[PDB]
């Protein structure tokens, strides 16, 4: 927010600082010597700095934008499902009428036409998860024999819920035209009593996706997985974590991830190398379990935050690792490109700046992913090939762009702002080329959601203070692509649109209020409201208010920049996008 | 096999794709005629870059993590003379090789910068001593008294 | 002429690499790297204010500049740089970005004793000094210019010690002046000389201070004979001398080995102790076998260079068990040589970059065969082959390690034929 | 090409600068009896012999008749300092000329063939 | 997962807190001590996830 | 026990391998005469008993009580007796069968509810209100949390009584 | 009932052989690997007196009887 933090911090203190007998605020000239009215007296040593118009609030501002864009654009917008226990009425079973409607509505052609569409389209995701789709086609065939049975085997119940998770993922990437052609739009809105004029992109495609997730749940609740741990729970949870559900529900997915990690560590299996005396069955089991566990670590990372108490990733991709690099770079490539970003993010919330040697080592291994994704094969028509290709291309460009964002913020290396501008437009052009058929659901993975979450945050945020030409040209395509995101995201999409609106009105708020000099402490509503709202969401994360209800029926007890601050606090309030 | 360089000057330089491989930013943009913005570097500096790519596009290049072939890498005497240029515009050459991730040209210019910085006379180093802040003047007097018998 | 502050304009990523590419010859008064002198047909066959400089400044510096008494032109040019160059702002920015990057720049500051003072020193790779600063002076203007919040920069813990730079009595006085301040947690590492079982009193004086540092890594030795006495374990730890302090053996991170002949001239390059290292590096040993070592617990990087002779882990014998084939089939029949796209990304043109068969071996007894190769390593990743010579077996690197170029061969002309498994 | 690496890799640089001091003094000494004439000399023509080496060691190292620097040869310890320095630098000059010999072995000198065991005997004599 | 989601760190009361909170630090440290007891006395391979993390009678239970 | 050459050449009480002053004097395999053929002396009393610890965790603590076997492809799900295991035993347990159980813990088990919830009479607020809440059918999530809280103590008061 | 055997030092007994398989087979019941290969589904999870009285006491005093 506000300190002095100006350009060209000098080398040696002057006489006035030696008189001053405090910390050497070795700026041009000092925030403390200017506070004593002796600004020029600290200037008079040698090479009297430069123009006093370099926006000295801006580095402090970007330091607090780190505080924001950590605690808002992952934590505040997505990872606070601030709901209630008293104000939420109970649901004892309530899916013997609801999930059984999905027992009703599911058809065999409605199963297999999703199944065969998602075969070459999504043939890396389940291939990363489980492998073969024909065994899964066999489970859908026997599933109509395993449909309304009486001898519900626990294992077979996991197989039943497995294909509900598969149907969830098939909804998550099928376009709406084939969805309305394979399924029917109307019996959902018959059963719910909702509107008939609701072609699936208008809200209920992702709801039916969540209903298939919920019917996986309704059988997994019957699987008794807390007394029956197995790997398919974790596999289907990978498949469900591919959806928007971890962002639309952080807390439930946290506990399910907790049970999945407990399930894995029940096995006490770590290494993934088929040694001399190993079973070939155990060999292939370890080979599969490798990608399983690294996708599990990827699921551990995306939900990580203050609602994530139990951690899994305990390794470093550079420089106390557990099984690191004893592993063939095939889909742990997908993990390692994520763990690349993971080690960046132990410096987002904490304002301690990482060593730039580390960041340039990251700049070195950046191109290793860039040209190991080029080290794959290529298939024009197999949609999983270009699908996985664009996934990894997007991930390395995403971490690249965020890395150059970190370069500009933490140290401001050469031309890193223009690097941000360049990689932003390259990624957005990749989205534009995937505005097509066969590639609209290259735009449905939550990586593009969280990526545009950062882009429309910071490009608008730098548009606030620097009315730049390239930032304006990018801001046009920001406002275009914000409306032109796919409907597979839904509620957080509209929360993102409100966030874009509130940041534009935050720009107007900077436009209407001049920044008050008070020696070197600057004052604006942009400062104080963003000071407050993060702490509001932290007090929501201070879950004592959800435990004050747990320890009985107890009830607790807990100027110009006081007015317009507290006018914009409810004018464009954050409470629209908490939930 | 040709891409277009559109600089901050916007002078469209349609160069070869093998020229584009040296710029690892642009070689990544190959995964994204084929235009891209360079909003800071002027196109004469870019033309110097392109002519270096013409010269050493076919040349062989080290692992860029070395010591022997990184720090003790010998210069090109052709690209010594080719970069016997303005001091100022040489820094724009440096910024161009940074901004487009052109590492052996960056090191090649960098070593010539290292040549020009080293070997400067202790006359002018005595003279250009505290141009920047660099010392309290008490220590400046102490240094000048430290060699007082000859200086 | 040159404009310094104009170079101080353009930022730190640029300004790093220049000091990374002006290594030690910051001065003009620097000698030649002696192979130009070797690759030649000419020997150098060589005034009075500089005679006054020899008269006055030089008797401080007849400890180090006395090595350079050839070419007295360089001598009489030297002391003028020894006035003002070693306070110039470029040098101070170099130390700023260097201690920012912690030896990623030009490195190896060294506790000297000149000005009869025990200040620090910077040597080049020709061991020529340039700068003599005391730790007060070094903490004063360049540490505390950037000691804003990071307390590890308030710490200064990356400095070698180098007995055999100086006299053993100067080792004695050096640790005496080390004692008077808290400079135990200031040094980074210690070096060794010997330039039978009788440790030198310099090294004894070294060991008897060695544990009290508590911030110690990065230890290097330089004599094979010395190597035998101090860390080539030989089954000896219950000794009054000759022991190198188990507690500070735990404290190190990495071991460097300068120049030797063999490691298992004895039975083994043994490190029963030395648990917590992560990186051993072989600089100029003549002969190695791989399995000449005890292979301590988890030393992830293992780089090496300038070798005469490498055997291998001779995995080639062990690969004759898992798929149980002929050697001539193993070259001819059992090489697919797929080099799909990442192989051509780096150069590595001289080594023949092979690959085993995905057809003739069929996803069992292949990952088994890969884990056979893994068994030779015992949890290490980084390999990094510089200037090398004369392996005795095929080059065998697992694809998991070979991907991301965790192994990085730099020089390959005395060698070829890498079968990447 | 054949030897130049392990020519350089024979030594630490400190030792190489010591030798570049020492045998330069040797060559200047040969020119002070004009044994090689004259500002540079090749690596191919250089005079190296055992008695040349030893007579350099005479005329510089041990022969302190030298009435400018005549008079430091009496003390039980300071002259013991003097000749401990002399036997150490004796070995150092031996290494310098051995290395210069090995330099001119690959640098095509018929006049570089040493009989080092004579020099061993010299060392052993001064040692005794 | 649940108890650490409430961010329970201190087990002794503090003066600048909610008295509901500062008393709930002991009134959930008792929960923490019985949680440590169930964490410890169920020492098994089927229980991999541990919680060691290190009035006048409930802390005394977890002491022994 | 001291080994063979400790009893033969009479050296120090040295259980080294083989000794610290006999291997050096040229008797390595000569001083390993310390401990199919048979033996019945107490040499196992050092040699064995630490294997007992391997028994003591994995068989007594793990194997006898904690090692659990299931049958995934045969066990029914919870769709069979969805609510009926819960509902029948909620309808049988009446106010005597709640509070007369709870008065065991109120008299006999003071450290437990102080170790978990504090007071049992504070819980009697909910358990008294449970008979205004057993009859409730549209609860909240909090009220069901109270339900499963007090039915855990209803569970506990069965066993120790 | 059995004389204690060895090879000179390493004592062998039916008690000793059975105290091995007490821990081995029960920890093999604690091996959840082939339960995970059940989770793999179609991938099939496959897995003197010292000689014979071991077979007596193991079969009669059946150590797997503590799994109910
Ligand atoms: Zn000041
Ligand atoms: Zn001031
Ligand atoms: Zn004994």
Residue with tokens 């003591």: F56
For residue D42, the number of C-alpha atoms closer than 13 Å in the C-beta half-sphere is 9
Nearest to C145 by CA among A12, A28, A42: A12
Angle among Cα A332, A334, A338 to the nearest 5 degrees reads 110
| Helix pair angle (A332-344, A280-302), 10° resolution | 30
Tokens of residue C386, six digits? 């510089």
Cβ atoms of residues A440 and A486 within 8 Å: yes
Cβ atoms of residues C9 and D2 within 8 Å: no
Cβ atoms of residues A531 and A1 within 8 Å: yes
- The closest CB to that of B134, out of A12, A415, A421, belongs to A12
Name the minimum distance, in Å, from the CA of A132 to any CA of chain B: 30
Break-preceding residues in chain G (C–N over 2.5 Å) = 47
Q: Resolution, rounded to a tenth of an Å? A: 4.4
Cβ partners under 8 Å of residue D114, min gap 6: D48, D49, D50, D53, D97, D98, D101
Instruction: Report how far ligand 3's centroid is from the alpha carbon of B145 (Å).
Output: 74
Please list the alpha-helical segments (H only) found in F11-161: 44-47, 51-55, 84-92, 95-108, 110-116, 120-130, 141-159
Cβ atoms of residues C99 and C143 within 8 Å: yes
- DSSP symbols for F67-91: -----TTTS--SSTTSSHHHHHHHH
CATH 2.60.40.3140 is right for the domain spanning D18-128: no
d(CA F62, CA E43): 8
Cβ atoms of residues D48 and D100 within 8 Å: yes
In a domain, B142, yes or no: yes
For chain E, which chains pass the contact test of at least 3 CB pairs under 8 Å?
Answer: A, F
Handedness of CA C48, C54, C55, C56 (dihedral sign): positive
d(CA A496, CA A460): 12
- What is the layout of strands, in order, in the sheet containing C395-396? C353-354, C418-419, C395-396
Name the minimum distance, in Å, from the CA of A231 to any CA of chain E: 15
- For residue G39, the chain A residues in CB contact (below 8 A) are 158, 230-232, 235
Strand partners, E27: none
- Over chain C, what HEC string results? CCCHHHHHHCCHHHHHHHHCCCCCCCCCCCCCCCCCCCCCCCEECCCCHHHHHHHHCHHHCCCCHHHHCCCHHHHHHHHHHHHHHHHCHHHHHHHHHHHHHCCCCCCCEEECCCCCCCCEEEECCCCCECCCCCHHHHHHHHHCCCCCCCHHHHCCCCEECCCCCCCHHHHHHHHHHHHCCCCCCCECCCCCCCCCCCCCHHHHHHHHHHHHHCCCCCEEECCHHHHHHHCCCCCCCCCCCCCCCHHHHHHCCEEEEEEECCCCCCCCECCCCCCCCCEEEEEEECEECHHHECCCCCCCEEEECCCCEECCCCHHHHHHHHCCCCHHHHHHHCCCCCCCCCCCCCCCCCCCEECCCCCCCCCCCCHHHHHHHHHCCCCCCECCECCCCCCCCCEECCHHHHHHHCCCCCCCCCCCCEECC
Stretch (H or E) spanning A154 = helix A154-173
The conformation of residue A199, written as its DSSP 8-state character, comes to -
For D39, which residue in chain C has the nearest alpha carbon?
C45
Cβ atoms of residues C365 and C392 within 8 Å: no
Cβ partners under 8 Å of residue C273, min gap 6: C233, C237, C246, C249
Under an 8 A CB cutoff, do D24 and C43 touch?
Answer: yes
Nearest to A241 by CA among A233, A132, G35: A233
Cβ atoms of residues A336 and A348 within 8 Å: no
Cβ atoms of residues G14 and G49 within 8 Å: yes
d(CA C350, CA A97): 71
- Pick among A365, A375, A392 to test the C interface (most C CBs inside 10 A): A375
d(CA C73, CA C67): 14
Instruction: Report how far ligand 3's centroid is from the alpha carbon of C232 (Å).
Output: 28
| Burial A13-44, CB ≥16 within 10 A → b, else e | bbebbeebeeebbbbbbbbbbbbeebbebbbe
| Neighbour tally for A276: CB within 10 Å | 11
What domain range is B83 assigned to?
Answer: 1-146
**Cβ-count burial of F124 within 10 angstroms (0-12 exposed, 13-18 middle, 19+ buried)?**
middle
- Over A218-267, what HEC string results? HHHHHHCCCCCCCHHHHHHHHHHHCCCHHHHCHHHHHHHHHHHHHHHHHH
CA A543 vs CA A83, A84, E21, E30: distances in Å: 11, 11, 11, 18
Strand partners, F38: G5
| Neighbour tally for C64: CB within 10 Å | 18
Closest ligand relative to A20 C-alpha: 1
Region at C285 (left for phi over 0; alpha for psi -120 to 50; beta for the rest) = beta
Region at E16 (left for phi over 0; alpha for psi -120 to 50; beta for the rest) = alpha
- For residue A412, the chain C residues in CB contact (below 8 A) are 11
| Neighbour tally for A150: CB within 10 Å | 7
SS3 call for D123: helix
Cβ atoms of residues A334 and A392 within 8 Å: yes
| Burial E23-59, CB ≥16 within 10 A → b, else e | ebbbbbbbbbbbbbeebeeeebbbbeeeeeeeeeebe
For E21, which residue in chain A has the nearest alpha carbon?
A544
- What is the layout of strands, in order, in the sheet containing C254-260? C219-221, C254-260, C279-285, C301-304
d(CA D69, CA D88): 20
In a domain, B48, yes or no: yes
Cβ atoms of residues B25 and B34 within 8 Å: no
Closest ligand relative to F1 C-alpha: 3
Cβ atoms of residues B46 and B7 within 8 Å: yes
d(CA C204, CA C220): 16
- DSSP symbols for E1-64: -HHHHTT----S--TTS-HHHHHHHHHHHHHHHHHHHHHHHT-STT----------SSHHHHH-
Q: What is the CATH number of the domain that holds B120?
A: 3.30.710.10
d(CA F123, CA F111): 15
**Cβ-count burial of A81 within 10 angstroms (0-12 exposed, 13-18 middle, 19+ buried)?**
middle
- The closest CB to that of C399, out of A47, A275, A328, belongs to A328
Under an 8 A CB cutoff, do G36 and A285 touch?
Answer: yes
- Looking at the 3D structure of chain B, how many domains does it have? 1
In a domain, B42, yes or no: yes
Cβ atoms of residues A126 and A136 within 8 Å: yes
| Neighbour tally for B143: CB within 10 Å | 18
Cβ partners under 8 Å of residue C403, min gap 6: A328, A329, A372, C342
d(CA A397, CA A369): 10
Cβ partners under 8 Å of residue A339, min gap 6: A297, A301, A313, A315, A317
Tokens of residue F73, six digits? 């492809």
Tokens of residue A393, six digits? 């291309």
Please list the alpha-helical segments (H only) found in A466-548: 469-483, 491-512, 525-541, 545-548
Handedness of CA A19, A20, A26, A31 (dihedral sign): negative
Nearest to C253 by CA among C285, C281, C292: C281
Angle among Cα A13, C22, B147 to the nearest 5 degrees reads 50
Break-preceding residues in chain F (C–N over 2.5 Å) = 35
Cβ partners under 8 Å of residue D98, min gap 6: D114, D116
Nearest to D116 by CA among D95, D89, D87: D95
- DSSP symbols for D58-104: IIIII----TTS------TTHHHHHHHHHHHHHHHHHHHHHHHHHHH
Strand partners, A89: F140
Cβ atoms of residues A524 and A515 within 8 Å: yes
- For residue F116, the chain E residues in CB contact (below 8 A) are 30-31, 34
- For residue C37, the chain D residues in CB contact (below 8 A) are 20
CA A113 vs CA A117, A180, C118, C283, D28: distances in Å: 6, 12, 81, 64, 95
Tokens of residue C328, six digits? 């001539």
Nearest to C278 by CA among C256, C262, C258: C256
Nearest to A81 by CA among A531, A569, A529, A537: A537
Under an 8 A CB cutoff, do D9 and C44 touch?
Answer: no
Nearest to A498 by CA among A486, A485, A511, A482: A482
Nearest to A574 by CA among A475, A503, A491, A483: A503
| Helix pair angle (C367-375, C315-322), 10° resolution | 150
| Neighbour tally for D103: CB within 10 Å | 24
Angle among Cα A339, A340, A341 to the nearest 5 degrees reads 85
- The closest CB to that of F36, out of G12, G35, G38, belongs to G12
In a domain, B90, yes or no: yes
Nearest to A543 by CA among E53, E24, F141: E24
Tokens of residue G40, six digits? 């793999």
Stretch (H or E) spanning B14 = strand B13-16
Residue with tokens 């294992």: A155
Stretch (H or E) spanning B4 = strand B2-7
Q: Say yes or no: D18 contacts chain C, CB-CB below 8 A.
A: yes
Q: Which residues surround ligand 3, an ion (CB under 5 A)?
A: F 3, 6, 14, 19
In a domain, B151, yes or no: no
The conformation of residue B37, written as its DSSP 8-state character, comes to E
Cβ atoms of residues C132 and C86 within 8 Å: yes
| Helix pair angle (A491-512, A525-541), 10° resolution | 150
Cβ atoms of residues F111 and F160 within 8 Å: no
| Helix pair angle (A108-121, A134-143), 10° resolution | 170
Angle among Cα E58, E59, E60 to the nearest 5 degrees reads 85
Cβ partners under 8 Å of residue C335, min gap 6: C354, C355, C356, C357, C419
- DSSP symbols for A450-489: HHHHHHHHHHHHHHHH---HHHHHHHHHHHHHHHTS-TTS
């Amino acid at each position: 927010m506000f300190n002095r933090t100006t350009q060209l911090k000098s080398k040696h203190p002057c006489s006035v600082c030696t008189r001053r007998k405090v910390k050497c605020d070795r700026m041009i000239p000092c925030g403390n010597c200017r506070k004593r009215g002796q600004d020029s007296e600290c200037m008079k040593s040698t090479k009297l700095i430069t123009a006093s118009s370099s926006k000295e609030y801006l580095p402090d501002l970007l330091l607090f934008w780190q505080n924001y864009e950590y605690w808002i654009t992952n934590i505040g917008l997505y990872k606070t499902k601030q709901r209630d226990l008293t104000r939420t009425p109970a649901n004892l079973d309530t899916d013997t009428e609801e999930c059984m409607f999905w027992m009703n509505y599911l058809q065999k052609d409605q199963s297999f036409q999703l199944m065969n569409f998602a075969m070459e389209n999504l043939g890396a995701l389940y291939f990363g998860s489980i492998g073969d789709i024909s065994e899964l086609y066999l489970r859908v065939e026997q599933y109509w024999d395993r449909r309304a049975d009486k001898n519900h085997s626990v294992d077979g119940k996991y197989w039943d819920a497995l294909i509900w998770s598969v149907f969830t993922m098939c909804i998550y990437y099928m376009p709406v035209e084939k969805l309305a052609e394979i399924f029917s739009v109307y019996p959902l809105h018959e059963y719910l009593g909702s509107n008939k004029r609701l072609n699936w992109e208008d809200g209920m495609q992702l709801v039916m996706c969540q209903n298939f997730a919920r019917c996986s749940l309704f059988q997994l609740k019957q699987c008794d997985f807390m007394a029956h741990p197995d790997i398919r729970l974790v596999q289907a949870y990978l498949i469900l974590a591919t959806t928007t559900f971890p962002y639309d529900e952080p807390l439930l997915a946290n506990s399910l991830l907790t049970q999945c990690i407990h399930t894995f560590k029940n096995f006490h299996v770590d290494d993934f190398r088929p040694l001399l005396n190993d079973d070939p069955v155990e060999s292939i089991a370890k080979v599969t379990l490798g990608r399983i566990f690294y996708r599990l670590c990827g699921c551990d990372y995306l939900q990580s935050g203050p609602r994530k108490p139990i951690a899994l990733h305990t390794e470093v991709s550079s420089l106390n690792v557990d099984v690191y690099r004893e592993e063939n770079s095939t889909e742990v490539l997908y993990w390692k490109i994520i763990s690349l970003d993971r080690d960046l993010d132990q410096y987002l919330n904490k304002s301690s700046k990482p060593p730039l040697k580390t960041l340039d080592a990251i700049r070195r291994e950046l191109d290793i992913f860039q040209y190991k994704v080029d080290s794959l094969e290529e298939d024009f028509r197999s949609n999983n090939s270009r699908f996985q290709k664009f996934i990894a291309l997007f991930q390395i460009s995403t971490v690249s762009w965020k890395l150059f964002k970190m370069y500009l913020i933490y140290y401001d290396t050469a031309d890193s702002l223009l690097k941000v501008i360049h990689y932003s437009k390259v990624i957005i052009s990749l989205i534009v080329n995937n505005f097509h058929a066969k590639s609209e659901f290259f735009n449905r993975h939550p990586m593009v959601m969280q990526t545009i979450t950062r882009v429309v945050s910071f490009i608008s945020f730098y548009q606030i203070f620097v009315e730049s030409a390239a930032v304006k040209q990018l801001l046009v395509d920001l406002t275009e692509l914000t409306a032109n995101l796919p409907t597979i995201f839904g509620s957080k999409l509209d929360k993102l649109v409100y966030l874009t609106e509130r940041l534009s009105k935050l720009k107007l708020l900077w436009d209407k209020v001049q920044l008050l000099d008070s020696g070197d402490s600057f004052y604006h509503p942009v400062f104080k409201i963003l000071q407050n709202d993060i702490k509001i969401i932290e007090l929501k994360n201070d879950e004592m208010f959800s435990l004050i209800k747990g320890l009985g029926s107890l009830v607790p007890l807990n100027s110009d920049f006081r007015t317009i601050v507290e006018e914009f606090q409810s004018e464009y309030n954050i409470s629209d996008i908490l939930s | 096999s040709n891409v277009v360089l559109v600089s901050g000057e916007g002078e469209r330089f349609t160069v070869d794709k093998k020229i584009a491989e040296r710029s690892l930013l642009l070689k990544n943009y190959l995964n994204d005629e084929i235009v891209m913005p360079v909003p800071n570097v002027r196109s004469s500096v870019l033309q110097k870059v392109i002519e270096w790519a013409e010269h050493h596009r076919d040349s062989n290049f080290p692992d860029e993590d070395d010591d022997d072939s990184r720090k003790s890498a010998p210069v090109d005497s052709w690209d010594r003379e080719f970069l016997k240029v303005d001091q100022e515009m040489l820094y724009e050459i440096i910024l161009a090789a940074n901004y487009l991730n052109i590492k052996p040209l960056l090191d090649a210019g960098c070593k010539v910068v290292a040549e020009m910085i080293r070997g400067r006379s202790p006359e002018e180093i005595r003279r250009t001593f505290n141009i920047v802040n660099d010392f309290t003047p008490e220590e400046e007097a102490a240094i000048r008294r430290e060699n007082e018998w000859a200086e | 002429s040159f404009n310094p502050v104009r170079f101080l304009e353009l930022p730190i990523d640029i300004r790093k690499e220049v000091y990374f590419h002006l290594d030690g010859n910051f001065c003009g008064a620097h000698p030649y790297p002696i192979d130009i002198l070797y690759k030649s047909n000419d020997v150098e066959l060589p005034s009075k204010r500089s005679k006054k400089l020899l008269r006055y400044m030089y008797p401080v510096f007849a400890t180090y500049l006395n090595i350079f008494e050839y070419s007295p032109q360089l001598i009489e040019k030297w002391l003028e740089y020894a006035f003002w160059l070693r306070y110039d702002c470029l040098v101070l920015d170099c130390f700023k970005v260097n201690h920012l990057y912690d030896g990623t720049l030009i490195d190896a500051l060294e506790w000297t004793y000149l000005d009869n003072e025990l200040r620090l020193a910077y040597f080049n790779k020709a061991s020529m000094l340039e700068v003599w600063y005391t730790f007060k002076e070094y903490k004063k203007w360049v540490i505390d210019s950037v000691a804003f919040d990071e307390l590890d920069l308030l710490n200064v813990s990356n400095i070698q010690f180098n007995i055999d730079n100086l006299t053993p009595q100067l080792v004695d006085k050096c640790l005496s002046i080390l004692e008077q301040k808290d400079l135990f947690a200031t040094i980074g590492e210690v070096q060794f000389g010997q330039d039978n079982q009788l440790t030198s009193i310099s090294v004894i004086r070294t060991i008897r201070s060695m544990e009290s540092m508590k911030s110690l890594r990065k230890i290097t030795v330089r004599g094979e004979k010395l190597y035998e006495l101090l860390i080539n374990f030989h089954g000896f730890r219950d000794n009054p001398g000759k022991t190198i302090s188990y507690i500070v053996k735990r404290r190190i991170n990495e071991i460097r080995l300068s120049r030797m002949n063999q490691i298992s001239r004895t039975g083994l390059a043994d490190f029963t102790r030395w648990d917590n290292l992560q990186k051993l590096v072989l600089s100029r040993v003549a002969y190695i076998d791989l399995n000449s070592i005890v292979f301590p617990k988890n030393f992830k990087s293992l780089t090496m260079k300038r070798v005469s002779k490498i055997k291998w882990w001779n995995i080639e014998e062990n690969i004759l068990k898992e798929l149980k084939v002929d050697k001539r089939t193993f070259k001819s029949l059992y090489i697919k040589e797929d080099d799909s796209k990442f192989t051509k990304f780096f150069n590595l043109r001289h080594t023949r970059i092979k690959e085993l068969d995905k057809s003739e071996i069929n996803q069992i007894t292949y990952l088994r065969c890969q884990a056979i190769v893994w068994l030779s390593f015992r949890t290490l990743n980084h390999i990094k082959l510089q200037n090398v010579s004369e392996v005795f077996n095929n080059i065998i690197v697992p694809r998991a390690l070979f991907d991301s170029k965790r192994v990085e061969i730099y020089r390959c002309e005395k060698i070829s034929q890498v079968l990447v498994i | 090409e054949d030897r130049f690496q392990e020519l350089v890799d024979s030594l630490k640089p400190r030792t190489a600068h010591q030798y570049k001091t020492y045998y330069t003094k040797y060559i200047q000494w040969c020119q002070l009896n004009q044994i090689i004439p004259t500002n540079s000399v090749p690596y191919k023509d250089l005079p190296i012999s055992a008695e040349l080496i030893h007579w350099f060691l005479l005329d510089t190292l041990i022969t302190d008749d030298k009435p400018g620097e005549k008079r430091e040869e009496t003390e039980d310890l300071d002259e013991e300092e003097e000749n401990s320095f002399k036997i150490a630098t004796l070995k150092k000059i031996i290494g310098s000329l051995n290395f210069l010999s090995k330099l001119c072995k690959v640098h095509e000198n018929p006049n570089a063939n040493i009989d080092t065991k004579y020099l061993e005997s010299v060392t052993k004599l001064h040692t005794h």
